[PDB]
Design an enzyme around this catalytic site. Structure first.
Site, PDB file in Angstrom:
ATOM      1  N   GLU A  11      -8.865   1.422  10.620  1.00 32.55           N
ATOM      2  CA  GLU A  11      -9.079   0.791   9.551  1.00 32.55           C
ATOM      3  C   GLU A  11     -10.634   0.475   9.413  1.00 32.55           C
ATOM      4  O   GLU A  11     -11.291   0.661   8.385  1.00 32.55           O
ATOM      5  CB  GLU A  11      -8.201  -0.434   9.325  1.00 32.55           C
ATOM      6  CG  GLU A  11      -6.622  -0.323   9.182  1.00 32.55           C
ATOM      7  CD  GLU A  11      -5.869  -1.495   9.155  1.00 32.55           C
ATOM      8  OE1 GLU A  11      -5.948  -2.169   9.842  1.00 32.55           O
ATOM      9  OE2 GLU A  11      -5.058  -1.821   8.191  1.00 32.55           O
ATOM     10  N   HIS A  23       0.719  -1.367  -0.039  1.00 32.12           N
ATOM     11  CA  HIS A  23      -0.013   0.145  -0.147  1.00 32.12           C
ATOM     12  C   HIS A  23       0.686   1.470  -0.135  1.00 32.12           C
ATOM     13  O   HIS A  23       0.399   2.161  -0.570  1.00 32.12           O
ATOM     14  CB  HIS A  23      -0.898   0.061   1.120  1.00 32.12           C
ATOM     15  CG  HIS A  23      -1.898  -1.181   1.199  1.00 32.12           C
ATOM     16  ND1 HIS A  23      -2.778  -1.705   2.279  1.00 32.12           N
ATOM     17  CD2 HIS A  23      -2.040  -2.094   0.154  1.00 32.12           C
ATOM     18  CE1 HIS A  23      -3.609  -2.672   1.901  1.00 32.12           C
ATOM     19  NE2 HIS A  23      -3.073  -2.963   0.797  1.00 32.12           N
TER      20      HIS A  23
HETATM   21 FE   LIG Z   1      -2.994  -0.337   4.133  1.00 35.40          FE
HETATM   22 FE   LIG Z   2      -4.582  -1.935   6.245  1.00 35.51          FE
END
Ligand SMILES: [Fe+3]
Ligand SMILES: [Fe+3]
Ligand SMILES: [Ca+2]
Ligand SMILES: [Ca+2]
Ligand SMILES: [Ca+2]
Ligand SMILES: [Ca+2]
Ligand SMILES: [Fe+3]
Ligand SMILES: [Fe+3]
Lengths: 166, 388, 510, 510, 388
Positions: C192, C130
């Site tokens: 998250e 990411h």
């Molecule tokens: Fe992430």
């Molecule tokens: Fe994550």
């Protein structure tokens, strides 16, 4: 010269650091610097914008000097002041486990950092200390975290309430 | 519907026209190179460098950082999120490291993925070609199932030694390299188990349970000192650089290389085993890949640092001496395994020559780089005492 | 002698047995909790299979970007405002992704069960993925977009402005500094589950609406990895539920983490969405309520009730303070536009109508203010005017929360107007809420972050911008702008004409 | 112990030595030429590197298709006329790609030098990839497009119409039946260098103009492989130039190959481009002259002069017949619309203006005819009118050239109107030009292809369609249509009620 | 410019509006499955079949064709582009064959591409790990450079044997498989040379030139009959099926499998050679891959053809006998190689064991399939007659 990354204060300290040519003098200056300029218990906030950077430069000097003065065993197990690291670690943890409250505990942990942060104490012992001291400090601090009203918590911390709005 | 309900600015006539009308006649700046301010390691800035360098939000008080000020939230007690205090090594810039293989996430999973599918095809071809018929039963059930199997715990331990580093690394380039070194170790541990699981499928009576190899690792003699070293490197070292350096530039370079290459890979062929070498080949490739990164960080960047070269070499020499002893002990105990082989499999001269190869490679690739005065015959002599 | 092989699950079946016992086999990090040694993980992965499944996603993702999307000039045909929003959205997310790597490395160290360590490990690898993906979005827009400045150097130009400080609190330090469990709550159970997962999906919608097909391509791929992280968060709670310490500390660490995350995202996300776009998808007010109250606070948290988890005690406070929060913040972000690494725009006529329609009373407050700044010439370089001056003339000081780093102007805000000023051991501290105040009072040494006013005190504005490389490649034109048009861009000299010198607003207090 | 490896070139350096001498080491195919055994190839590839460079392309291509393009609904937002055109363009090209596999296999067998065999081999594999790529285009439009019929079964529904016969001549049989060198000229020297290579690029142009981003993604990828095939054709000439037979046969096989290829593409490509689209890229008259005269006839062929290659003696004749060729053919294609596997449309007002502007005289001939047919109801099922009837009524016989299979109508054509009819051993033969007539006279046994009028003689139209599965899913509605609108589609019954019965036009001379 | 001059119908407001306006409300047919009329071999139709089956424009007069009429252009003389006359075998449908691995171009090159990069990494790790240090010089300079090298001409010849089949194959599914079978053969030939080139780079005086290995193949005694058999299978066979069947189900299934697996593969490890086996691993995986395809075509489709089962089996049993003799002769000559091996390397008990494994595997995978009753003992004996 008043820059963020480069300024007269930083230059002046670099010059001051260049003159620390023995371990004992350099390590002592580093410990004094930490008492004077770090943590909320610092002696003054005059170097607030540069102390972090200056401390790192002082650390560099103490490190190179210690590596040159100490034999291999001492570099791994003794503090820059010649103390036995394990003894210091164990002794401090002992005091921490005996702490009666979160107020006594924060003083112990914070003081330990100001006094033994690498390159004073070997990293291995220091972080083992962080592991143990931090656990207790949190255990004491986080118990009934919201029970004390702010009105009273302000008094316990000992802040001077300057202004309040609602 | 055929067209859907959501209208997109790129294709919706009304919206796109609004967008196009607001656009400038040309770009507001001609410097279209992300990371243009990063000092390139090579001729031109690489995609690896642009996507990686300076992702870590370090302030200038952590060598090489471009930000300013303290962290916003620290640990109870005051410990900084990241700080110089987490390692004995010093440098003018923690962002200097470069993985010679320039591996960011995409290239990394791409290669491992190719290896996974290649592995599956191999096992299928191996099983369909009935090549198992040529493997000596004793080597298979004793040395592969028990001793090679036990080695998975060694690699697993080395994998785990990287946990603190993943958290404490002082730069993006080092964190990424470190994560990949650790990830390859658990992969190897899993490939050892995979081989045992494969054998359980094509060999009647072969038990894939880890009970046997684990009992060997935890209570046997052959790997006793190896396990003691792994336990120490993993849990007694709190300095992320001492961990990565000692693991890769001392223990795994000596003990690891000897076990994988000089024992199992060297002997497996002598017993009709083409299976284990398939996986050891991956482990060795991974080892050589990690070596390049380990050498760049510790030798090119730190050991040769323009301001802290002398200091860092002194520290790494310290660490080498510290971990060379436990490593020699690990090798010494491992010598006990040779007595269990069928008579005539190998002899003291071959064993000694192979030890010297591992030691000489280590002196050339690691010890010499920091001026550590290794004595090759004294090291081999100490290890050979373990021969029964 | 038939073609046979072995898969991930078959090997994973034995992974739990990989760890063994020895005296010193214990986490190296301070913690009040004990993660159960037999904790299991949801997905049965091994390194090889993990790489394959991610490699497949990369293929589709990069294929679209390098081929069709580039052929369509997708990097250009995006609304100017959104091109700027992505400089902030992608690079700020990038740091969250990055610190999550370290955070899960710390959680991997904390877990004692091999399967739980393995679950955290997968996330370690995903957050590296990411990090590189968010980096690629900025990399792509810099290479093929209408304005590369900012996209090409955010890693250093982000340090000039105040919004970045608050981002580091929730997306960096909040993720890695403290009890590993507290960090897990900030990252997985709150961060998250409540914000980033929903945020990532939402961004793809706003991006598509504004002509951006680059971000959807990357973010939708990032989203496919989140299932594993949600599971990690859930398992963290399960792993510590049977320990007596949990009943004592869990809800406190959870409430602190909730307030921490919310304090920043409530005003910042709504601001980026509504003020950083041309075409609107949904009013932040309804979005926030659904995400925080319904989805997270209701569904997600409710499932953890069986483990002793309760709804954050500060939830009600968060809601009350939420309504006008993002509107209050944009006034500050625009007034301090010279400190950013992106170009900002005043709400246009059609937008003010949308705002008033969705937030009755918006015009009488914010609308009129923007109209006044416009009249003062805030968009024109020759005006010699910057909104900050308006705050000075009308005696509206801007403070920085010592804990969350979120800027606030209590005398002007329509939302929260609370202000607490304390002096302690020779230093002044300013707080914007009662939760952040308790955090500092109880943990003074955790919050010593110096604010922009403290660091820039007595410095002339143009000098700070120059020093921190806030200029375009021509070395004169500012990266940041008070408008998003292609002409009349402000230069360092225009900001210098102005003679703006920073002062620490807290020094007024005696 | 430096990391070392070996690349393709380092292995290819010794490839020429792989072949060894021995009695029967000679081609198995009849040929008048002798390819030199020391012939080299331009690219130094080996099996493994070849796979990698192609695998990389596949990654991008399929990535774009499955991800971004599908998310953009690229398979749907295409002009109806172009969706139909791609049924023909992709499937018809597919057979050319497919037969090219067998052709290069034949050339691989002809070549004696290991490197020349290797060059042909690379093309063998490339043509396999192109076969699957063209297949994927139809596959994609079938799965995600506005009208799957035709895209989903062209491999069998194409056998119903006359246009397919001519495609097989230039793209199938012309590629594999005859002297290996003649086939090579039809495929590489003429086919690929003069038509297919340029055509594939042009198609991406027309596709983009009409909303189709699927075709560009695939065809541009196919295009990246053509350089190797160009090299093969060029090296084919080089390998036989030093042979005596060459001076006596090359220019004849080349001319026959040029006429063969142009005979079909000149009218067909212009037709598909101009009549199978809404938005135009460029007039076919201009395109043709550049491709054939400038690029190929001039530059490309010119460079082979040193090898004894001369411009086809039929070039000028080809140019004479070209001007109205595609316009004349569309009249026939539309008149016989029920025999296709795609839907056709008549030019709209803007298009007629475009045709007249670019082809003075177009309206007075084609235009008025189309408007006449439309007013008569050729687009309406209840009209009972199919343009084929207009041809019968006005005595305009439609013939099929015995050699090229191209349909022609001498009595109506604005272009060529020559017609030669011969009887031989009880069979009639119709030819449309002097080059094809010669081919048949000199090689009667090479051309016995039965035409549609001969096979369908005496059969009622709807019966042929029903038998060859020219129906959509509902089993009643025709795949082919005289318009591209979604309503009023013709059904098998609408055709049956017309009672159209095929007749062999040549029998009128009896 | 920033926007370019070309307007695209998907993004251009004006053009897209026109397009959108012409679109129907819904698809004009709900059957969105290309190749829906193809008879699936498995549960549901596969991408492999949809994209391949019926690509070849065969008319109904060629079993299975869906088109009608004669070809448009034929060879001088009248020979059809494709015809039943190009092979002895007959069937009810030439499109019945199915590659069990379902390989169309994309998957095929993806797999080979991974293998290429895996190979590159392997060599790099091998060289960096200094594993060459354990390889026996004689085996390296004699058996690998000369005899293994010579075998590249065998694989190369088998590759070329596929040329006619690429032109004559009577269906798309059969042409694709055939092409891939041949492509993998030249790949192996190239890998044999690649290894010789690798050795040349890491072994000072090693010569990569094909001169030595070529002379051995063209004028040597060990591969004399092998070369003769290859020269025949390739240039004396004009029947594409006879060529494909005889190469894969007779010659390479016996000679090839012995030379590759039973000689170099089985013996390489004993000489410290882990290099050659890496490549032979690929050749074997390829052999196994092609085998599944070969079995499905000649046995599942032709051999068990609902109408010509007996006929085809007769033709294949005929070809088997026709080529089993040259193949046996190929093995006999190769036996002379064992005499060149250092004393004690291998004995006759091992040779006999390996020979039976090959013959047995052959009877199990090919011979028994077409009812070609073969005498294992007679075969092994005839071959064994070639030893010292
Ligand atoms: Fe992430
Ligand atoms: Fe994550
Ligand atoms: Ca012992
Ligand atoms: Ca010996
Ligand atoms: Ca010595
Ligand atoms: Ca005061
Ligand atoms: Fe092609
Ligand atoms: Fe081609």
């Amino acid at each position: 010269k008043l820059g963020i990354h480069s300024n007269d204060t930083r230059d002046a300290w670099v010059n001051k650091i260049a003159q620390l040519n023995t371990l004992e003098k350099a390590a002592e200056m580093l410990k004094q610097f930490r008492m004077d300029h770090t943590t909320p218990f610092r002696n003054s906030y005059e170097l607030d914008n540069d102390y972090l950077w200056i401390e790192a430069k002082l650390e560099e000097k103490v490190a190179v000097l210690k590596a040159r003065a100490f034999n291999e065993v001492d570099f791994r197990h003794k503090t820059a002041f010649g103390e036995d690291a394990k003894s210091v670690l164990d002794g401090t943890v002992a005091k921490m486990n005996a702490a009666k409250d979160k107020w006594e505990a924060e003083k112990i942990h914070i003081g330990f950092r100001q006094a033994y942060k690498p390159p004073i104490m070997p990293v291995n012992y220091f972080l083992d200390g962080e592991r143990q001291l931090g656990t207790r400090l949190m255990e004491l601090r986080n118990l009934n975290y919201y029970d004390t009203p702010l009105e009273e918590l302000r008094k316990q911390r000992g802040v001077r309430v300057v202004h309040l709005q609602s | 519907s055929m067209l859907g309900e959501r209208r997109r600015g790129l294709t919706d006539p009304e919206m796109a026209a609004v967008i196009l009308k607001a656009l400038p006649e040309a770009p507001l700046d001609g410097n279209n190179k992300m990371g243009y301010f990063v000092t390139p390691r090579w001729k031109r800035l690489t995609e690896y460098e642009a996507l990686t360098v300076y992702a870590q939000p370090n302030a200038d008080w952590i060598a090489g950082g471009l930000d300013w000020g303290d962290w916003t939230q620290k640990f109870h007690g005051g410990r900084p999120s990241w700080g110089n205090e987490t390692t004995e090594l010093r440098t003018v810039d923690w962002f200097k490291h470069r993985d010679p293989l320039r591996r960011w996430h995409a290239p990394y999973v791409k290669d491992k993925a190719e290896e996974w599918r290649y592995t599956d095809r191999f096992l299928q071809g191996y099983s369909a070609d009935g090549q198992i018929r040529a493997m000596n039963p004793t080597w298979r059930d004793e040395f592969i199932n028990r001793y090679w199997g036990a080695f998975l715990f060694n690699e697993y331990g080395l994998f785990n030694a990287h946990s603190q580093g993943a958290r404490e690394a002082l730069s993006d380039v080092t964190r990424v390299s470190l994560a990949f070194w650790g990830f390859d170790k658990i992969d190897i541990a899993q490939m050892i188990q995979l081989e045992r699981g494969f054998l359980a499928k094509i060999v009647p009576g072969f038990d894939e349970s880890t009970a046997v190899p684990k009992a060997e690792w935890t209570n046997g003699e052959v790997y006793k000192s190896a396990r003691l070293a792994v336990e120490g490197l993993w849990q007694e070292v709190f300095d992320w650089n001492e961990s990565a350096f000692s693991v890769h530039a001392v223990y795994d370079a000596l003990f690891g290389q000897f076990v994988r290459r000089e024992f199992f890979q060297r002997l497996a062929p002598r017993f009709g085993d083409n299976l284990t070498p398939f996986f050891i080949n991956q482990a060795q490739t991974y080892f050589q890949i990690a070596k390049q990164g380990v050498q760049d960080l510790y030798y090119n960047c730190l050991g040769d640092d323009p301001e802290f070269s002398d200091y860092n070499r002194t520290v790494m020499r310290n660490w080498t001496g510290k971990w060379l002893e436990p490593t020699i002990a690990a090798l010494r105990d491992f010598m006990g395994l040779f007595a269990k082989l069928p008579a005539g499999t190998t002899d003291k001269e071959e064993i000694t020559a192979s030890l010297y190869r591992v030691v000489d490679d280590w002196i050339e690739d690691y010890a010499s780089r920091i001026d550590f005065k290794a004595d090759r015959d004294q090291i081999v002599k100490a290890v050979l005492a373990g021969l029964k | 002698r038939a073609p046979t092989s072995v898969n991930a699950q078959e090997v994973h079946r034995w992974l739990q047995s990989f760890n063994w016992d020895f005296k010193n086999n214990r986490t190296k990090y301070a913690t009040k909790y004990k993660m159960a040694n037999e904790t299991k993980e949801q997905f049965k992965l091994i390194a090889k299979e993990y790489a394959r499944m991610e490699a497949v996603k990369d293929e589709r993702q990069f294929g679209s970007l390098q081929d069709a999307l580039t052929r369509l000039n997708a990097g250009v045909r995006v609304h100017p405002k959104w091109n700027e929003t992505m400089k902030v959205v992608s690079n700020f997310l990038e740091v969250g992704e990055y610190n999550a790597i370290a955070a899960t490395g710390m959680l991997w160290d904390s877990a004692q069960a091999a399967e739980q360590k393995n679950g955290y490990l997968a996330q370690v690898l995903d957050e590296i993925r990411h990090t590189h993906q968010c980096a690629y979005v900025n990399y792509y827009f810099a290479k093929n977009g209408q304005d590369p400045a900012g996209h090409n150097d955010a890693r250093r130009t982000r340090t000039i402005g105040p919004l970045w400080k608050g981002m580091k609190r929730v997306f960096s330090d909040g993720f890695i500094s403290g009890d590993a469990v507290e960090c897990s709550l900030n990252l997985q159970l709150v961060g998250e589950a409540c914000f980033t997962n929903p945020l990532i999906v939402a961004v793809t919608e706003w991006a598509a609406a504004n002509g951006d097909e680059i971000t959807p391509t990357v973010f939708l791929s990032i989203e496919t990895d989140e299932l594993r992280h949600m599971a990690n968060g859930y398992q963290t709670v399960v792993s510590i539920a049977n320990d007596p310490a949990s009943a004592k500390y869990l809800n406190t660490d959870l409430n602190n983490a909730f307030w921490t995350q919310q304090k920043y995202f409530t005003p910042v996300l709504g601001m980026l969405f509504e003020y950083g776009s041309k075409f609107k998808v949904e009013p932040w007010v309804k979005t926030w309520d659904r995400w925080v109250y319904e989805d997270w606070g209701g569904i997600w948290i409710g499932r953890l009730g069986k483990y002793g988890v309760e709804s954050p005690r500060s939830l009600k406070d968060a809601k009350q303070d939420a309504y006008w929060a993002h509107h209050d913040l944009y006034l500050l972000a625009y007034a301090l536009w010279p400190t950013g690494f992106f170009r900002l725009a005043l709400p246009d006529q059609e937008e003010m109508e949308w705002f008033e329609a969705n937030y009755p009373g918006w015009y009488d407050h914010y609308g009129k203010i923007y109209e006044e700044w416009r009249a003062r010439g805030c968009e024109d370089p020759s005006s010699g005017f910057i909104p900050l001056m308006w705050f000075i003339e009308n005696n509206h000081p801007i403070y920085i929360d010592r804990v969350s780093q979120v800027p606030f102007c209590p005398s002007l805000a329509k939302g929260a107007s609370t202000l607490r000023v304390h002096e302690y051991n020779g230093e002044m501290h300013t707080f914007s809420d009662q939760w952040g105040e308790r955090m500092w009072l109880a943990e003074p040494e955790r919050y010593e972050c110096q604010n922009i006013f403290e660091q820039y005190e007595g410095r002339e504005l143009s000098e700070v911008i120059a020093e921190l490389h806030g200029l375009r490649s021509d070395g004169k034109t500012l990266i940041a702008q008070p408008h998003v048009r292609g002409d009349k861009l402000w230069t360092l000299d225009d900001i210098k004409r102005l003679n703006c010198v920073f002062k620490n607003p807290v020094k007024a207090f005696n």
